[PDB]
């Protein structure tokens, strides 16, 4: 079949409420290890700082006078003191601050983004959720935190406990790998809840996700709108002349 379904769940209860349809070239591509490899190694080269510096014999401090007479000493002839053979000499082929970044075609990088997204779809590790996804922290606790009655120490000591027992019930905690929450924008509860308890998972903004982030944890919990915006930006391989992108087969029962 050319199109594959994508169930949309309600994050708190994980109830299937809507059904969307995506192309088979979006979430059902063959697994290409070479293509995924080239996109992961391409991202590491860009994150590298590449600033290591070393001095050569033409940069080491000191005078370029000849150390000893050419003849008559009875020792090996020597020139300047900055030679690689001397004690404090410079490294000939030492590291220098340069650019470690490589290039990768946009169409190849966009194929690896959808190949890593299909690897999670066929394994059941891609759980799309309705927009607005945020950790449903208790209401009374949120009333105290905002009030300022609770201290910072206790405010963090509770979130760490709730997030732990909330992720173990869902079997999404450190036991079953970890979870990555990908939302459109930053959310207070979600992002602040996974900054204090990071062993259970992490949260990321759509603009801060890489092909490597889609393969690290155990599952990817992405919003409905975020997923559509991720495939629309990484379909340069497909739309060059369309394919089903978020078509609603079953609408939410208002």
């Amino acid at each position: 079949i050319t199109n594959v379904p994508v169930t949309v769940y309600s994050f708190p209860e994980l109830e299937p409420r809507s059904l969307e349809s995506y192309s088979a070239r979006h979430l059902h591509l063959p697994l290409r290890r070479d293509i995924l490899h080239l996109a992961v190694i391409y991202e590491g080269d860009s994150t590298r700082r590449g600033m290591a510096s070393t001095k050569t014999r033409y940069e080491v401090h000191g005078s370029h006078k000849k150390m000893s007479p050419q003849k008559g000493t009875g020792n090996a002839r020597r020139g300047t003191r900055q030679s690689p053979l001397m004690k404090g000499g410079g490294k000939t082929f030492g590291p220098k601050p340069r650019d470690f970044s490589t290039k990768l075609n946009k169409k190849v990088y966009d194929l690896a983004w959808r190949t890593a997204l299909s690897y999670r779809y066929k394994r059941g590790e891609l759980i799309v959720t309705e927009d607005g996804l945020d950790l449903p922290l208790p209401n009374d606790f949120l009333w105290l935190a905002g009030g300022g009655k609770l201290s910072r120490e206790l405010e963090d000591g509770y979130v760490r406990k709730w997030v732990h027992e909330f992720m173990t019930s869902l079997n999404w905690g450190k036991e079953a790998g970890r979870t990555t929450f990908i939302t459109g924008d930053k959310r207070p509860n979600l992002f602040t809840g996974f900054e204090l308890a990071g062993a259970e998972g992490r949260a990321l903004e759509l603009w801060d996700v890489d092909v490597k982030d889609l393969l690290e944890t155990g599952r990817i919990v992405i919003e409905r709108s975020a997923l559509k915006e991720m495939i629309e930006d990484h379909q340069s391989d497909l739309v060059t002349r369309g394919p089903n992108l978020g078509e609603v087969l079953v609408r939410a029962p208002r």
Partner: protein, 243 residues
Amino acid sequence: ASILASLSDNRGAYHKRIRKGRGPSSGYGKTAGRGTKGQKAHGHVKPWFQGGQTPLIVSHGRKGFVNQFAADMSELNLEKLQEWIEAGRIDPTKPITPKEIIKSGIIGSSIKDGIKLLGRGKESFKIPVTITVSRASASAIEAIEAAGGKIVTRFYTKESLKRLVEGKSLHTDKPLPVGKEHVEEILAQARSLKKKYYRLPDPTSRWDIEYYRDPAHRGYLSHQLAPGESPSLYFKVPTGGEK
């Protein structure tokens, strides 16, 4: 186990790395593949050096010159123009101007000094079109008209073609009128535009003027000629009779 711990490139993609001067059993050890105490081992030989013998470029000399004033045309064939019309990429009902030729991808993404229509596949071209190019071969002018079309070779420049695709200049297959009579007619057309549109330049040199002033090339300036007049600005058609 983990997906990140199981990814790799195809084996054929990887090639042996040769680190010279790292032992005898590597095959590139002591001398590192240089030989034994020569100029190629101690220093470097100039690339142009032949041992002292004079090169052929000096014995024979460099022949000819490189023309720095020749125009660079984007060659377009009828074999390819027909394929674009059958595919729905060039609407033949409307005039096929340079703006529509460049934005169609038929001559590529490179804009050059002009576009010349060649006559490859002229025997299979039977679509009536109204094309306007910079030049056209004799074999293409008859094929375009044999099918019931119209062709006009206008004068363009590299900057003029860019402004056409950029919308900064409107296309027109007629030269600018000269004379006091037309001053108003043209000024009125400019006011109604309500937008700054650059004008397409006209040929100023002797050659370019003569190229578009003759009917053989279907030049846009051919009207300025008489049935007995010649396109040349200097030569004239002699008279044959008893004198």
